[PDB]
Design a protein around this ligand. Structure first.
Ligand SMILES: Nc1ncnc2c1ncn2[C@@H]1O[C@H](COP(=O)(O)OP(=O)(O)OP(=O)(O)O)[C@@H](O)[C@H]1O
Lengths: 48, 806, 144, 107
């Protein structure tokens, strides 16, 4: 809690499709949306 | 992270199909793993923005977005009522995968630096036409009111048949049958009334926007010619459109702009009417479901539809002009956008401080991929991140959007660049000068001097710096690969300038002005804010008082101020299951801690929020109120409902002084301080508040191990604003006892040197990683969806500040 | 242009007539570029054309230009400087001596056409002589 | 104590037996969430024989409750861990430990 702590961590990044949905009084946007993600490959521990 | 029950639980593995459902009405976010329900939901979260699907990851994955339609075939049926996400692509956009708020990109000859991304708002989908009801038509306009009612419909039918649309009993776009191509007067009653209303509405909007109209011809106005449409343009039912024929008119540019505004207004009115009827937007048209590809505010509409609407309105304006009505365009009302804070908006990239040069002749290049607000030049090592480049004495830069040179202000210089132009910045510290070249040609001031800046004091040195505005892209070439420089040999090489990073074994590190607000200690020299550490007297506890230095004077800075205390209080790992002098046993066995905030008389209680914040608070909201606080409920139950837990998560636990100001005292300035006390039970997770001794109705519940920082948000209304009083109460320990281990049993209030007041700062310098993850995004197919791949690992050594959880 | 500049620097009557002409005719020197020896087109035209000349000299020659400048400071003649350079050719700065010369040589040899230059001794002594004379007289002028 | 929560499934058939050498990777965190040990950082699997009391009780029982190839989370209380004494300089007294264990193999 006193000395600064160090550790090796993985870089993380985010990806989105250019799909934007919201809610507002009088808006022209539908309110219910659905999508899916299928996981093809995952290396549980590529690093430590 | 909260564990969530689901059949056959397992961390996401290959051949797993996650299904995400967003219901903005509740609001709620629910999941489904391989078709099986996930017994947990997010709900009751903030809705002041646009939601997008997202996947976060480290290296070593391959995944595919399935968005429905031709952008990934769903493996499972969407729950009833939910629309596929591929329907949400805007009319002027193409579906594809993106990074989020990137400041860096790859490009043909190296990395590109990217300025802030200009993003839409949830309020950008609310059509907002101008009010046209009270605009009663003056006599001549009322006379012409229904005259356009027929003519516009005639033009509409004629345009349909010219593009090939031939009347039919019903709506069948394939064989092209359409029911509304019948005489306007006999057109179906609803559509005829709508057309009458719009024909009047064009004039009503002309007046509403401020246009000046007046009759100019009577006999020539009456003189009218129609169009003799042949059998090709005659209908299946035989009706012949008879639109007004007149081509003897021209259009002024102001009139074209007014045509654009009229088209915008008309489309927005139509969109509002359809929204009221219950329609919504969809990339794919669905009439039975009241989904329409055009149901979006005009600004976001596609170019072709804009042109069509503008053509119609332009024809109407031509009719009026030919009739002679002097439609003087309304006096343009000057206005700006000011969408954001200019000082904090443009992203600044500078070389690291260790690279500062204090001698020699140095050169580097900056290609402007875009043509917007970009600045490039030389900055001092102590460059601030929240000030525009060259607005102070810490940077000598060139802004080639309009051709200005910036240092302690702006001045015309050089010429604006174009896309692809390379600005060569040169600094000569032997002569103390700065030179700018555009595409190899030196830029000269209006006077005629070759140098941009002169008599430059060396000081601590200079660093390459650039600033990109929202939506701008640049390419910074510091010259490590001397062959990469494009205009060095033409200008600078013979003059003896040396590429900034010529003899460097590795690329130069850069830092960028990250716009994530962070709490930093109040500067000891701050022009406007002063914090005084008052000692504890016999009848007063230790205090930290804030005073506005420059109150009630010109140059005064009055704006929201977010303050916290440097150290947190941490709730216990496990919560308990289920005179005015302290009693030793009670005080030594208690786990409740207290601290007060004294809002000084003069400081309006309605402009002060008192409470706690977690390490996660990062909002520099200039219009803050308790409705802006982040909040979300995570609810977990069994298969057949049976909610098992419902936890509320937030980062700001505060109360409003307006809750305590009394209605009698409301509307007048009070002459008494307001003391808001905050109590936290570190063993039960309960947080309560008191006002002037009396208890308040607000109470919060947190989870074990939670870290809370004492905090106060205030809009200064007086030279004395607030005072953190780190005192105690009967049988209640002071804050120091919870903050400091050595004082865990000491009931004497203390304010050690570490405990200090910190304020929220909107921008801070942040190091740019030298290597970035290589993410490959592509379209696997029409049924496979969109593939994201990342296979190369990448790590860093992180330094963790334990108290800030950062 | 360098020869004309050398004549301008040497002869003082030429400078006098230049100043006269410009003052009496009120010619706008700044307008021509886009009263002051700085705006004097005689030296300005040189300064404009100078990179063309310096591009000829390989960066190895820099030492030889320095030495020729010393000769011109010692007030030698053109033949004196030519022979001085001819018998001091071996003083040619070696690229390995300095890292800066490394990348300067990289550029100079990479650019086409200069691969065959810096070969023939009489050409080398010539180019260094002309460029050094021009540089020396330019220094003399820019000295106020 | 010890609570076992699966993260990734194993074969579900081959379970450790007394006298066998379990080869694992693990990452030890304190209940608060602070990492204090991880064999993956040393990049060498940890081998320990069951029944010889080489590792603490929480391991001895939790890993026995796992199957070859299974990744699990072991939550071990102080009594089933270094207890009141703790591990001077590493683990505070009376600390609950959370381990992300992966039973690589048996031998
Ligand atoms: N997308 C749109 N943008 C702007 N105005 C529109 C739009 N759609 C309809 N309108 C307005 O409504 C009118 C619709 O045309 P009209 O009433 O003559 O035909 P309709 O057959 O009733 O309509 P639709 O072809 O849309 O079914 C347009 O002239 C215009 O006034």
């Amino acid at each position: 809690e006193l000395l600064l702590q160090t550790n090796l961590i993985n870089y993380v990044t985010s990806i989105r499709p250019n799909i934007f949905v919201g809610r507002a009084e009088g808006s022209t946007q539908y309110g219910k949306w659905y999508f899916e993600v299928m996981v093809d490959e995952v290396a549980p521990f590529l690093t430590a | 992270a909260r564990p969530v029950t689901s059949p056959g639980q397992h961390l996401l593995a290959p051949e797993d199909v996650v299904s995400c459902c967003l219901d903005l009405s509740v609001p709620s976010i629910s999941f489904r793993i391989n078709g099986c329900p996930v017994q947990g939901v997010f709900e009751s979260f903030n809705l002041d923005g646009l939601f997008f699907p997202v996947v976060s990851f480290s290296a070593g994955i391959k995944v595919r977005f399935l968005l429905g339609g031709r952008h990934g075939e769903f493996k499972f049926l969407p729950p009833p009522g939910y629309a596929p996400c591929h329907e949400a692509v805007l009319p002027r956009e193409r579906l594809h995968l993106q990074p989020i708020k990137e400041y860096r990109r790859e490009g043909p000859r190296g990395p590109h630096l990217v300025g802030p991304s200009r993003c839409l708002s949830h309020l950008d989908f609310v059509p907002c036409p101008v009010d046209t009801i009270q605009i009663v038509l003056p006599p001549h306009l009322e006379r012409i009111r229904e005259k356009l009612a027929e003519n516009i419909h005639e033009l509409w039918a004629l345009t349909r048949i010219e593009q090939g649309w031939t009347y039919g009993p019903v709506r069948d776009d394939n064989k092209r049958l359409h029911p509304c191509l019948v005489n306007f007067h006999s057109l179906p009653e609803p559509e005829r009334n709508y057309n009458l209303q719009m024909s009047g509405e064009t004039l009503k909007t002309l007046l509403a926007l401020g246009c000046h109209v007046g009759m100019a011809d009577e006999k020539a106005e009456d003189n009218l010619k129609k169009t003799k449409l042949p059998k090709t343009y005659m209908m299946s039912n035989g009706y012949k459109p008879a639109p007004l024929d007149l081509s003897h008119v021209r259009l002024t540019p102001a009139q074209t702009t007014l045509v654009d505004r009229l088209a915008e207004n008309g489309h927005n009115v139509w969109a509002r009417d359809r929204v009221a009827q219950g329609w919504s937007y969809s990339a794919v048209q669905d009439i039975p479901a009241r989904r329409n590809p055009r149901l979006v505010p005009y600004r976001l509409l596609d170019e072709a539809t804009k042109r069509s609407n503008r053509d119609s309105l332009c024809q109407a304006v031509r009719t009026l002009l030919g009739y002679g009505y002097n439609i003087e365009p309304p006096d343009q009302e000057p206005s700006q956008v000011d969408s954001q804070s200019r000082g904090d908006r443009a992203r600044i990239f500078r070389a690291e401080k260790s690279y500062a040069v204090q001698s020699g002749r140095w050169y580097f290049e900056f290609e402007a991929v875009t043509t917007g607000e970009m600045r490039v030049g030389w900055a001092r090592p102590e460059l601030r991140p929240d000030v525009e480049l060259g607005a102070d004495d810490l940077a000598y830069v060139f802004n080639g959007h309009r051709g200005q040179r910036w240092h302690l202000g702006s001045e015309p210089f050089g010429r604006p660049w174009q896309s692809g132009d390379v600005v060569g910045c040169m600094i000569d510290l032997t002569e103390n000068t700065i030179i700018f070249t555009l595409n190899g040609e030196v830029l000269m001031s209006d006077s005629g001097s070759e140098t941009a800046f002169r008599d430059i004091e060396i000081g601590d040195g200079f660093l390459p710096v650039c600033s990109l505005g929202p939506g701008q892209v640049g390419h910074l070439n510091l010259g490590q690969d001397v062959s990469s420089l494009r205009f060095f040999a033409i200008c600078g090489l013979q003059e003896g300038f040396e590429p900034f990073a010529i003899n460097m074994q590795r690329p130069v590190t850069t830092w960028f002005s990250k716009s994530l607000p962070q709490f930093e200690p109040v500067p000891l020299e701050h022009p406007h804010y002063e914090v005084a550490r008052m000692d504890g007297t016999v009848d007063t506890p230790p205090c930290l008082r804030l005073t506005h230095r420059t109150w009630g004077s010109q140059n005064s800075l009055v704006e929201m101020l977010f303050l916290r205390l440097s150290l947190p209080v941490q709730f216990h790992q496990h919560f308990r299951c289920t005179d005015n002098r302290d009693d030793p046993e009670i005080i030594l066995n208690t786990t409740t801690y207290y601290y007060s905030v004294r809002v000084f008389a003069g400081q309006e209680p309605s402009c002060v929020w008192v409470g706690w914040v977690t390490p996660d608070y990062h909002q520099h909201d200039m219009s803050f109120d308790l409705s802006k606080v982040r909040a979300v409920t995570v609810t977990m139950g069994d298969e057949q409902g049976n909610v098992h837990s419902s936890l509320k998560c937030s980062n700001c636990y505060m109360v409003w002084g307006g809750d305590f100001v009394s209605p009698g005292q409301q509307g007048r300035i009070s002459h008494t301080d307001l003391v808001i006390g905050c109590l936290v039970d570190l063993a039960t997770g309960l947080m309560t508040f008191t006002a002037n001794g009396k208890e308040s109705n607000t109470f919060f519940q947190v989870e074990p191990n939670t870290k809370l920082f004492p905090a106060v948000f205030v809009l200064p209304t007086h030279q004395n604003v607030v005072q953190f009083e780190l005192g105690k109460q009967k049988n209640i320990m002071p804050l120091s006892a919870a903050m400091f281990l050595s004082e865990r049993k000491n009931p004497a209030p203390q304010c050690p040197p570490r405990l200090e007041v910190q304020m929220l700062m909107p921008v801070s310098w942040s190091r740019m990683p030298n290597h970035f993850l290589q993410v490959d995004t592509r379209r696997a197919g029409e049924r496979l969806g969109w593939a994201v791949q990342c296979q190369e690992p990448l790590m860093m050594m992180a330094l963790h500040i334990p108290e800030e959880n950062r | 242009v360098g020869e004309i500049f050398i004549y301008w620097s040497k002869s003082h009557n030429f400078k006098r007539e230049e100043q006269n002409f410009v003052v009496q005719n009120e010619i706008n020197n700044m307008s021509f570029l886009t009263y002051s020896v700085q705006t004097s087109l005689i030296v300005a035209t040189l300064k404009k054309m100078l990179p063309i000349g310096l591009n000829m000299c390989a960066p190895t020659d820099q030492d030889l230009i320095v030495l020729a400048k010393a000769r011109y400071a010692l007030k030698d003649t053109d033949e004196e400087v030519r022979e001085f350079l001819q018998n001091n050719l071996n003083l040619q700065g070696k690229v390995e001596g300095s890292p800066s010369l490394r990348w300067q040589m990289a550029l100079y040899r990479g650019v086409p056409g200069r691969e065959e230059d810096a070969d023939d001794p009489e050409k080398i002594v010539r180019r260094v002589q002309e460029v050094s004379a021009v540089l020396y007289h330019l220094d003399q002028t820019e000295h106020p | 104590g010890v609570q076992v929560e699966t993260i990734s499934p194993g074969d579900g058939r081959t379970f450790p037996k007394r006298g066998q050498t379990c080869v694992v990777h693990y990452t030890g965190m304190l209940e608060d969430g602070k990492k204090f040990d991880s064999s993956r950082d040393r990049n060498k699997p940890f081998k320990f024989t069951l029944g010889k009391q080489e590792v603490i009780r929480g391991w001895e029982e939790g890993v026995a409750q796992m199957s070859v190839g299974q990744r699990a989370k072991l939550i071990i209380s102080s009594d089933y861990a270094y207890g009141a004494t703790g591990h001077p300089g590493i683990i505070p007294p009376h600390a609950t430990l959370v381990f992300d264990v992966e039973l690589l193999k048996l031998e």
